[PDB]
Amino acid sequence: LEYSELYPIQNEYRMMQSLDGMWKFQFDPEEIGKKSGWENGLPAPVSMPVPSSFADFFTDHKERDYCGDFWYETEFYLPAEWRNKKIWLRFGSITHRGTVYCNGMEITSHEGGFLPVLADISTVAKPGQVNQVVVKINNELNETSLPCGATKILNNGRKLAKPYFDFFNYSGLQRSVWVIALPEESVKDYSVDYELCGTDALVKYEVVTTGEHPVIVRLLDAEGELVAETEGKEGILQVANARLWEVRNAYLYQIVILITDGNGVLDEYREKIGIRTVRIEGTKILLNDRPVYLKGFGKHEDFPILGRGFHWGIVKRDFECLKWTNANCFRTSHYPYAEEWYQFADEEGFLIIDEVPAVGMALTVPELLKSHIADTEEMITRDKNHPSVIAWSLFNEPETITDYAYEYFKEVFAAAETYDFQSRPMTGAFEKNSKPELCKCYPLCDFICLNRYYGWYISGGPEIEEAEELFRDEMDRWKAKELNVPFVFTEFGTDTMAGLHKLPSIMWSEEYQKEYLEMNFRVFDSYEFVQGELAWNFADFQTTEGIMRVDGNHKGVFTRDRQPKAAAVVFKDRWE
Amino acid sequence: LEYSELYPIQNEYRMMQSLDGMWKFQFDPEEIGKKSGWENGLPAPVSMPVPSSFADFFTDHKERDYCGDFWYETEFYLPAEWRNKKIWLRFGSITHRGTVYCNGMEITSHEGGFLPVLADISTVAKPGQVNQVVVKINNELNETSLPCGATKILNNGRKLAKPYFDFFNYSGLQRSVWVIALPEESVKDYSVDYELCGTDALVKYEVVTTGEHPVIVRLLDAEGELVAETEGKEGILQVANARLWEVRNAYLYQIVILITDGNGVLDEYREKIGIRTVRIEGTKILLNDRPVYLKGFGKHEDFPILGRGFHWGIVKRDFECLKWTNANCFRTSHYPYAEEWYQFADEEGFLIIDEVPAVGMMRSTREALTVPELLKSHIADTEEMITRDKNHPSVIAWSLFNEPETITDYAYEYFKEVFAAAETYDFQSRPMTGAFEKNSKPELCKCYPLCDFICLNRYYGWYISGGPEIEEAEELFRDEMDRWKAKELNVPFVFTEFGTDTMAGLHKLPSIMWSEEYQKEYLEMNFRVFDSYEFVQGELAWNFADFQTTEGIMRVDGNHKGVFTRDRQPKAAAVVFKDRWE
């Protein structure tokens, strides 16, 4: 990549300043901002919080549902001491696509709404002065970028997003924004991989810098004591009596990467890492050479009013709830999350399946593939050095039963392999139409993830005993193929309205959610090769309006304000 | 004050760095932190978001309900370029009281959980290195500090907060935290006051600095154009054809305060202000010489999971909801809010009644030894609130109490001291008030004459003669208001609370107490009474939104008198206000 994905830090060599706060904001329904000088300042803005999704602040439909071009602006004072450093704007994300301007100049554009955007403003920045950033953003959905959908035009030119996916089209500046200053020669990337040697461990590494000066790499333990040191951009750190990062029992070392010249230090990058191995052996998932059974949820970045806006408070509550259920894992359904989620999983010992926004899947397919590969490259480069990340999910319910689909996913998986220094497991989640007899893509997967709704979308309610038989029939067919790979259920659930009680149970009641889960567990537990269960969803979350969604999706085990339905105890007791 | 209340800014002279994020946190039930050296680092911390209240993250009762000492820690890199500046830690608040340490050294302590805490770390800060801040906080309630309550000790030594007030005892680092660097000679305070002169206006000002160099004061209009300039620490800016700040139609000038020596500028402070006058004339509240009728709500700093934690998102949603109801006013019930609420009210043209946390002084809810200490606390909080908030055009009145005892001569002497302090600290001498409970009967109350306008909290049709007795409630309400009318006080009355607990989705025909329909009928009855008296000049409903309280048999997941739900969606009664206030 042409920029660094490294999380920003503050030290003697690197500076950072937050641009979070109230920005200026303006909708552009006529698509005239770039024709009308808006990159030099918005003509009639309102205030908009950053980070946040814009939609749920407003009280009128047309602003909530806005689809098209819209603009953000803020001003910031740049300290004089940042003069002739490499100065970057760093956006946690820009959703879905956008162009960044600084002091009236076009800097960069990005497609993909869930990964960092880096804009080099070195040549236009004004140290010791007030500076301006303006972002043009667009949130339309199409079939050449992820996640896929369409854009409908109503009978007055008004656009409406039409997702091919079951989550609301939240957009805007949903993550923190920084301005940062780097040394002219800096650490741009690094990668770590691990090998266990009895009571010792090896940390294999590579470092990419923007120059040719020597690199020194140090490893510090949790209390900051030096435990290993080596020279070179590629090397091995030897760790005596290594304290491994374990499931629900984290330990983090600190890697310290120095660029030196002489004499002195030119740059220093530091990050917490965890020494751990993950591999698939037969039908088992091994973490540090011991089998682990995945227990947890698919989540969303979703909270009242903020939308997908990042807040550490949502992270804290959600992890306390996860721990209370005795979970050990979640999937970042259906897009990479803010970086802070992974930082915290590293601290709490949670396992993450990191998912690219390949959901909602012609002459457009070659362009779509380019987008998909780009998002995959960015995700893996950003997230690879988190110990929590133990697998990549490269799709959620695509078509997989044609040879075309096979050729498409071969390319995606090939790109993922070249970018992951650790070569950790790659998978994706399959929908039911990917029949064991028809699917051509499951052979690309290190382990297989199934989304299934036997007892909800298939033979629900009075037909639940038929649903169980259909489920066992399918699992028997998978069993008979003897693939010798682990299966993980990445989705199963029922919409459940908090407070809806019925005896005997009905679809949508709290009691049916319990009974459905119990049926599913009986099926899971009947097959040796099932090695994980991630329920859909951790919490009720927002979707597009329609006749099948009663204020979003209610398959949460928790409510949207993070309180447990009756089924939450069922998980807690089972996962204990 | 031994520090500045001024909101931090970033420019050539002043630097700031946010310390918001995930801090380290540890409960201290045995009160061993200081004797164990925790000011040098917490031994077994968990992560805690800042800004936020700590309580609602946890899944266990004892952590949620924790009462006592607890500690926060974070680390921050200080730029080398901040050396030889005055370096301060600035906490938007520390709830309720705490002691700030930096690099292991005790810096300052503060009591009062809703106003800024400034800690001068100049002598211990290490520029060009990682620095440490540790804060010891306590969230107990007592009768010598605001807001008042008690602390109960359970059999095993565990403490439980017992408020004398109807809101949950949220605490922690609930607002943003910064480390800032100021020049050695800086602008510490300033005050503005306005006079209207035809199409023109005067901006009277005073500036307090930490040195003796000359001061230049400039006023810029909303596009940055210079409209007035003068010299001196006291002066008058003359503004031709002034664009006044108006209700729901703001205009903000920018005041620029410079300290200079012979070789240039030493400090620059900049803030948006609005040219407007507020006064009481007979029963009228006059804004820019025209009567205004107050329409709006009591609020709270309260939101799911964050508790009282500040977030601009809550500000944005709440103001959109306020504007949709056609409101023009809120009261900061029952404590000063984060500064950002006032900044935004200034932009949106909302009127604010700014309230000090003098709540929980009721004798019934709750002896001659504690009142003098309480008075000192009350006056300190008043001084800090007014110094912090005086230059916001939105702030048009100070509320100095919510439902204290007022029927004794001693209560009069107490409040005379508070009002006198407030007068001393407010350069504008703007209207002062407090909200009275029903026990402050017109025949008994000794304190309403201290007020420039009278704020009443009344629940005729809820706590008094509710439900099937609502016709009696109306008669009792009219009886009381007829008594006030016959006193002919010639002051405005504002209803600062009236409402009914209302469960979203509870519908009944005919209505019952707790239903959405009864909330509507109650409000209609109250409006009929309000509109029967000339001297009523405002109505602020209780509450804008459902909010958290102490658990109990009278609170069904907090207080449900909101017109909006806690996640900020309208109950049926919200339309009733929208239509009336249009």
Ligand SMILES: O=C(O)[C@H]1OC(=O)[C@H](O)[C@@H](O)[C@@H]1O
């Ligand atoms: O229908 C549902 O509830 C879910 O179904 C799925 O197949 C999707 O992967 C998930 O995103 C939806 O939310």
Ligand SMILES: O=C(O)[C@H]1OC(=O)[C@H](O)[C@@H](O)[C@@H]1O
């Ligand atoms: O009882 C109520 O709902 C309210 O009554 C009041 O008198 C208090 O001033 C207020 O803080 C309570 O919440």
